[PDB]
Every structure is written in C-alpha cells, then in structure tokens.
Design a protein around this ligand. Structure first.
Ligand SMILES: Cc1cccc([C@H](C)c2c[nH]cn2)c1C
Lengths: 257, 211, 338, 60
C-alpha cells in the first residue's frame, strides 16, 4: 500500500501547514490577540510549519521506497534537521508551560516583566537549546550510538515532559482555589488533553527509542509506526492550544468564515 | 526627516503604552451620601488617585462630581479591571432630598442595579463596600430595618440585618455566571489588593480556557 | 395662578403646531420625485492611519484638508497627515478621558475636552520646542461634549450641564451662555458664516441658537429619543439630525418643519455622527452597527455602505475640499474612504 | 417655579409669531442648490485619479 500511504502523509502535511498558518495569521491580524504570550504560539506554529515542510516529504519516502535515501550528503544535515525541528516543538511545549504557570502562580510580579524584551530572549533560548540537543543501497538509519540515544532521549523528551507535567498538576491545584463556582469539569478536562495528547502521540516512540539501549525485543514494524506520531502531534498542536481560548476562536470564525 | 521624526514619535508612543498597560484601574462609584470620600481617604469631573500597595500600581477614578446623565459617558469606563462601589448603611434612615418618601437606600440599589446589569460591564467585576458600619450598628438599636423592607422577618439585629442587606445587594446581578461581587464592611486597601489579585489570576486562568 | 401660565402655554404650543401645518404644500419626497437617482457609491479605504492604542472618540479635519486631529482614551491627542500617514504631532494630555477635538481654522491652535469639564487649548508652534498647554477654560458644570472654534480666539463649547457657552480664549471668561435647553447637549454645529449654530440635546429636540444676542430663535421637535449628532446643509438653511432613534431626519430652518426621514427596517441601532458631501447630497451617517451608511439627502434611498470597521464608528468627517471621508471607530484605526 | 415658567412663556411667544415659507419653496431651494454644485463634489461624481491625491497625485 504505497499510493494510499503517500496520500495519507500528504493529508498530514496539508492539515499541519493549514492549521499552523491559520494560527500565525490570526495571532497577528487581531487587536484582541495582542498579548505578549502569543509570541510563543507564533514560534511554535513556525516550528510546526518547518517540520511539516522540510521533514515529512523525505522521511515518508525513506519508508515508502524502502531503499537508499535520495542523496548521501543531504542526510547528514537533514538527519539532524528533523531531530531539531521536533525538539523545538517539544521544548516550546515546555516554555508555554512555564509562561502559563508564572502568569497564574505569581501574577502581579510576573505581569510585570511579561514584556517582549524577555519573551524574545526565551524564544531564542529555546531555539538554541534545540540546536544544542540536535547536533551530537545503504539506508540512512537514525544515528543510534550507545551514548547518543540516551542523552538525546533524556534531554529532548524527558525534561520537557517532567517540566510540563510538574507544571500542569499545579494549575489544577490553583484552578481549585480560584473558581468556587462549579467549574469542576472545565479546568479538569482541558488540562487532561493538553497533556493527554502530548504524551499519547510522543511517548510511545521515545520509550522504545531508549528501550533499544538494552536490546529489548521491540518489533520493527510497530516501532516504525510509533516513529510517525511526532508529526501528527505537530499537526494537532495548533488546535489544542487555540480552540479553547475565546479570542482565538473568534479570530478563527472571522478569518476562516 | 519627517520619517525619522515619526519613527521616534511611534517609539515613544509604544513605550508609553507598554508602561501604562502595567496599571490597574478602578472606577469608584457611590450615591450622594455613600461615603466614598471616606474610602478614598482611608485607602471638577474625574479625580484620579494614584497609589501603590505591596509594589503594585492602582489608579482610582472618582466621577461623582459629574452631575449629568450617566448613560452618555459611561462608555469611557469599559476596560477598568474592576469597579469599586460604595453604599452607606446609615443611609436607610434618609429620604431623598428632592423626592418624597424615596428611601435613599432604594435609590442606591437602583443605581447599583443599573451599573451591574449593563451592557458594558458584563464581565468587569464589582467590589462592593458597605461604609459606616458602626453608625448603622448603633442606629438599628431603635429603628427596625423592616421600615426599609416590608418583606423582612427577623427582629432588629446586626449579625442578621447586615447579611440581609448584602443578600438584597447580591440578588441584583443577573449575570451570575460572568462577574463576581466581593464585599467588605468599611486594611481596606489590603482587601482591594486581595480582590484584584483574584481578578487578575482569574483573567489569566481564562485566556487559556481552564476556568 | 401658575395654571394660567400652563394653560396658555399649552394653547401657544398648539397654535405653533397648527400654524406650521398651514405652511405645508407637499412632502419633499413628492417634489423631488422626478429627480435623477444617484446610483451606487463605492468607497475603499485609501489609507488607514494607525497608532492609537485605545478607542477613538472624535476628530476634526483641518482647514488645510491635509492634517486631521484624533483623540483616544490612550491619553494622547494625535495630529496626523492624511497623505503620508506620518504622525505630525502627538500631544500627551493631562487627563486621559477625552470626548472632543477641534482643529483651529488657521491650524495654529488645537483644543480638547472631556469628563474633566475643562476645555484645554494647545499651541502647536511653541517657537522653541514641543507644544505646551496654552490655556484651560473651566466653568462648565458637566462634561464637555463638543466644541468648535469660531476663530482663533473665540470657542463655543457645549456640555452635559444642559447649556452651551461662548468663551474668550484670550481671558478664559464666558462671553455668553446659551440656556433654555432641557436635556444635555450631545452635539452642535456652526453655520457657514459663524453667526448661528444648532444644538441638539438628548431631549429629542434641536434649537437654532444665535450668537450675537445669545438667544434661541427656533426649536425643532419630532425625534423620539436622544440626538447624538447634527450638521448643516452647506448653505446654512437646513440641518440633518442623527438620533439614537436609529433614524436621521432633515429639518428646515426657514420653513421650520420636518422634510425627510431617513430610516429603514434593517437598521435598529442608533446613529452616532452625520455629515454632508460638499454638494450636500450625501448624508453620510455613521451608524453603531459597525457600518457607515451613505444616504441620498433628497430621496432617502440609501446608496452605499462604508462597512470596514471592527467596532462602532464614532467619528465621521468630510474635508472642506470635499474629496474624502475620514471615519474613526472604537478599534483604534482611522480610515480614509476616498 | 413661577419666574422660570414666565420666562419659558415669553420665549415661546417670541418664537411662535416668526414667519415661515411653504414647504414647496424650501424644497426648491434645496434641490436647486444641490444641482448647482454637481461637478464640484468629488463623491457624488467620482473624480479620476488625476484628482485623487490619496491614490496617485501631488503629495509633497
Ligand atoms: C531524539 C529525537 C528528538 C526529536 C525527534 C526525533 C525523531 C526525528 C522523530 C521521530 N519521529 C518524530 N521525530 C528524535 C529521534
């Protein structure tokens, strides 16, 4: 099944780019969405666009044709250019967590210093951390060295998932001391997806990735399927972080409809 | 030339807007004998009172000097982080100066009802203040509160009357699901700090839809 | 007895009402019935003067037809340049509650006003640096809802104190006071010769105030609610009132009656500004439905719509040249619908 | 109350006896003026770009 899978990947790419472009446009062309926090949304949407254009077209081929990559010198720079265009996302989900934690736990103190002078620095810090974690017949198997998979796995998806899971179990606590108006299902559900999605899509991959370090019998086909959830998560991301907010929804209604 | 001048003008305007956005604004309202001046002291046209508590920045606009129709200029106050309101508990024993047999507190409720159930302040929360508590606590010892409500049961009492009045005041915000109404019986600025911290946190906790 | 005054006043009002009828021959819509329609009118925002950080509450085109003022709740009174969009000036006010503006006819002074009940006047050409508050006229008992220069000295303001007042910017003393108007005074407009001006109260009425002798001359009624705007036919013999009744009306100074009523079923919101084309045949009415409807002042048949604003239109002004329409809405952008 | 009512009555009597003109003459003097300034209105009759300083013309 080649044409069907290629078409499915094409649907993936189209949806990803469409949603991220919509979010990027709605963030700018709207008076209401003028808060500084939206710089993170714009940067994350840009990362989703990049990983949806410069990455998927090649890594779908490498699995479809089932043979030598198209090229031998453009790999050493995309093999680490798809592994840094995801870590950018996985760490922008650990930055939109610290932001949306400090804007609740310490409101008055953080509502000052909540200006672009620091948001830009944070975004540059994320985009340099990603790069630091990216650089460490024949097929281009992702570099699996006994000392590089461990560090990449525990620096790219075990800090950003131990810092957005110890930062969304508080916003659950705070959202219990600050509602007192029978909104139990509101702050209890929407806080379950933003992590429910982030860990159902990704973790099934990283678990096997670093589990190979002990040579466990991970099936090859199932692993090469787990490999492909990262991009679908890069697709699902813009809607998760934008639907619920009222201003984003109004901008979506005004632009799309 | 003109391009550079206008660029510098834009830069200054952006800087001033950024510095101003870090302010909290409080429209202060009350009836004639409400006692808002007492609140201002403790804590023509618009009078702006700028203060700072625990390293914050409040502006409070007193507009009671404006003797004209209220629906024609209230538009300007759509965007205040809260609306402080002041009522006079010793005002249930005063009839309107011009009108006859118009209990001053009834007029105060009418004003507050107009403020709350209004199309502009549909989310802007109110912070209610019930001034002159002690004077009322002494006044009620001879004049039953039933004079000002022919639907009252429970003989004169301060632990009950001041809760019944608060009930009648909180029974007027038909937007029960949108705006909160805090209440304190005039550390008052400490209460305003603790009640605008809640507004700021509950407006941050709604930009992401959690609330 | 006072009842004598009441009864005779009632009979006097009835006499006026039944004597106006005698001056009726046929409705304006009958006489102009064979007039040539105007068709459709399209207007596209040539510029979009940007920079305000809050609502926009007024404006005034300069006599040059190039510069234009604009006031916002951001606390700054800006003076733009329509052609290039460069902000020529940006005055930092003292109180950020503004409800008016008035660019001088000679362009050397500007004014302001608002809830502070004070009409401040600013001199643009300091001769040594930036601007400075030239004067501050105080003496009104209510917010200042409109104000226009008679010349570079006299300024006639109107407030919610149920009065108007002609000032003297040289000495800051009310030269005259126009009292006799029941409700507020939501807006006014001078005449071509600056010897008469109509004031529109929130009492559902208008009054043709004189200036020389400080006394009304005529009173027009027929509106069913407040009157948020008013303007003159460019020849100073008719004025169009825009109410919160959602209907504009065209009143005649000479005949002292009502001529046309511009209303439609599809509109239920209230007007907030009106203006005429230089030919006086386009009653541009800036509604509160996010729109700014063009009309046809002689047949009432709407002939366009300037719908481009994300928030209600609060300012609407046609230059003296006649070839532009600057509209300002609560979303902080000024549009120029050439 | 009395004096204010008397002043109102005086104003009303002064404004009642003012003279007027039939609606026909006012209608004629309205439409005649509206016609008189046809070519001088750049909105009623849209003007070409040669007279559109906003679109393309002398702006210096
Ligand atoms: C360690 C690491 C970090 C980020 C991305 C990846 C790769 C490219 C992947 C697989 N599926 C989605 N992304 C890795 C291996």
């Amino acid at each position: 099944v080649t044409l069907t899978l290629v078409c499915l990947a094409g649907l993936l790419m189209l949806l990803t780019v469409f949603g991220n472009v919509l979010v990027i446009i709605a963030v700018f062309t709207s008076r209401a969405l003028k808060a500084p926090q939206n710089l993170f949304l714009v940067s994350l949407a840009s990362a989703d666009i990049l990983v949806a254009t410069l990455v998927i077209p090649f890594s779908l081929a490498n699995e479809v044709m089932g043979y030598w990559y198209f090229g031998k010198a453009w790999c050493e720079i995309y093999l680490a250019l798809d592994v840094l265009f995801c870590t950018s996302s996985i760490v922008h989900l650990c930055a939109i967590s610290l932001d949306r934690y400090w804007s609740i736990t310490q409101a008055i103190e953080y509502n000052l210093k909540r200006t672009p002078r620091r948001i830009k620095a944070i975004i540059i810090t994320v985009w340099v951390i990603s790069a630091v974690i990216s650089f460490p017949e024949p097929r281009c198997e992702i570099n699996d060295q006994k000392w590089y998979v461990i560090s990449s796995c525990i620096g790219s998806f075990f800090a950003p998932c131990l810092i957005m899971i110890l930062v969304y179990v508080r916003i659950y606590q705070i959202a219990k001391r600050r509602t007192r108006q029978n909104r139990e299902k509101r702050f209890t559900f929407v806080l379950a997806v933003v992590i429910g999605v982030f860990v159902v899509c990704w973790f099934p991959f990283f678990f096997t990735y670093t589990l190979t370090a002990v040579g466990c019998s991970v099936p090859r086909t199932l692993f090469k399927f787990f490999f492909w959830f990262g991009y679908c998560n890069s697709s699902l991301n813009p809607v998760i972080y934008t639907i619920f907010n009222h201003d984003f929804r109004r901008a979506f209604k005004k632009i799309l409809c | 030339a003109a391009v550079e001048r206008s660029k510098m003008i834009d830069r200054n305007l952006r800087e001033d807007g950024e510095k101003a956005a870090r302010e909290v604004k409080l429209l202060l309202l009350g009836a004639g004998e409400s006692g808002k001046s007492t609140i201002v002291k403790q804590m023509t046209g618009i009078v702006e009172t700028h203060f700072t508590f625990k390293d914050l920045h409040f502006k409070m606009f007193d507009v009671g000097a404006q003797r004209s129709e209220r629906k024609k200029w209230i538009h300007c106050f759509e965007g205040v982080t809260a609306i402080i309101f002041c009522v006079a508990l010793s005002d249930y024993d005063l009839v309107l100066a011009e009108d006859e047999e118009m209990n001053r507190m009834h007029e105060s409720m009418k004003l507050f009802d107009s403020i709350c159930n209004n199309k502009w302040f549909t989310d802007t929360s109110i912070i209610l203040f019930l001034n002159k508590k002690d004077l009322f606590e002494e006044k009620i010892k001879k004049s039953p509160l039933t004079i000002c409500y022919p639907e009252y049961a429970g003989s004169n009492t301060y632990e009950e009357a001041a809760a019944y009045i608060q009930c009648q005041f909180e029974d007027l915000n038909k937007r029960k699901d949108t705006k909160e109404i805090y209440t304190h019986f005039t550390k008052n600025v400490q209460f305003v700090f603790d009640a605008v911290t809640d507004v700021i946190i509950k407006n941050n906790l709604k930009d992401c839809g959690l609330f | 007895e006072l009842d004598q005054l009441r009864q005779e006043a009632e009979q006097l009002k009835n006499q006026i009402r039944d004597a106006r009828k005698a001056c009726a021959d046929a409705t304006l819509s009958q006489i102009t019935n064979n007039i040539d329609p105007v068709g459709r009118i399209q207007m596209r925002t040539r510029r979009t003067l940007r920079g305000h950080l809050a609502k926009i509450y007024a404006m005034h085109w300069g006599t040059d037809s190039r510069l234009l003022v604009s006031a916002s709740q951001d606390g700054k009174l800006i003076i733009w340049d329509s052609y290039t969009t460069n902000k020529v000036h940006a005055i930092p006010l003292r109180s950020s509650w503004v409800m008016t503006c008035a660019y001088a006819p000679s362009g050397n002074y500007v004014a302001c006003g608002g809830l502070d009940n004070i009409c401040s006047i600013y001199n643009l050409k300091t001769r040594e640096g930036n601007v400075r508050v030239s004067r501050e006229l105080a003496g009104h008992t209510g917010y200042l809802s409109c104000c226009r220069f008679l010349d570079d000295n006299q300024i006639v303001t109107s407030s919610g104190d149920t009065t108007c007042a002609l000032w003297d910017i040289e000495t800051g003393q009310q030269t005259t006071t126009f009292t006799g108007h029941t409700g507020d005074v939501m807006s006014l407009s001078l005449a071509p010769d600056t010897r008469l001006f109509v004031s529109g109260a929130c009492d559902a009425s208008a009054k043709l105030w004189d200036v020389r002798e400080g006394m009304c001359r005529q009173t027009f009624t027929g509106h069913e609610s407040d009157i948020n705007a008013i303007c003159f036919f460019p020849n100073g013999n008719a004025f169009a009132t825009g109410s919160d009744d959602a209907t504009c009306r065209l009143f005649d100074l000479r005949a002292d009656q009502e001529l046309m009523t511009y209303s439609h079923d599809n509109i239920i919101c209230g007007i907030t500004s009106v203006s005429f084309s230089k030919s006086g045949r386009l009653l541009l009415a800036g509604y509160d439905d996010f729109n700014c409807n063009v009309w046809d002042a002689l047949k009432a048949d709407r002939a366009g719509v300037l719908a481009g604003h994300d928030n209600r239109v609060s300012c609407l002004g046609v230059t003296d040249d006649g070839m532009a329409v600057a509209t300002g809405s609560w979303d902080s952008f000024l549009k120029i619908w050439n | 109350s009395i004096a204010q009512a008397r002043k109102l009555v005086e104003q009303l009597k002064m404004e009642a006896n003012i003279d007027r003109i039939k609606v026909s003459k006012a209608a004629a003097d309205l439409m005649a003026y509206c016609e008189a300034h046809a070519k001088e209105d750049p909105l009623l009759t849209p003007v070409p770009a040669s007279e559109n300083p906003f679109r393309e013309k002398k702006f210096f």
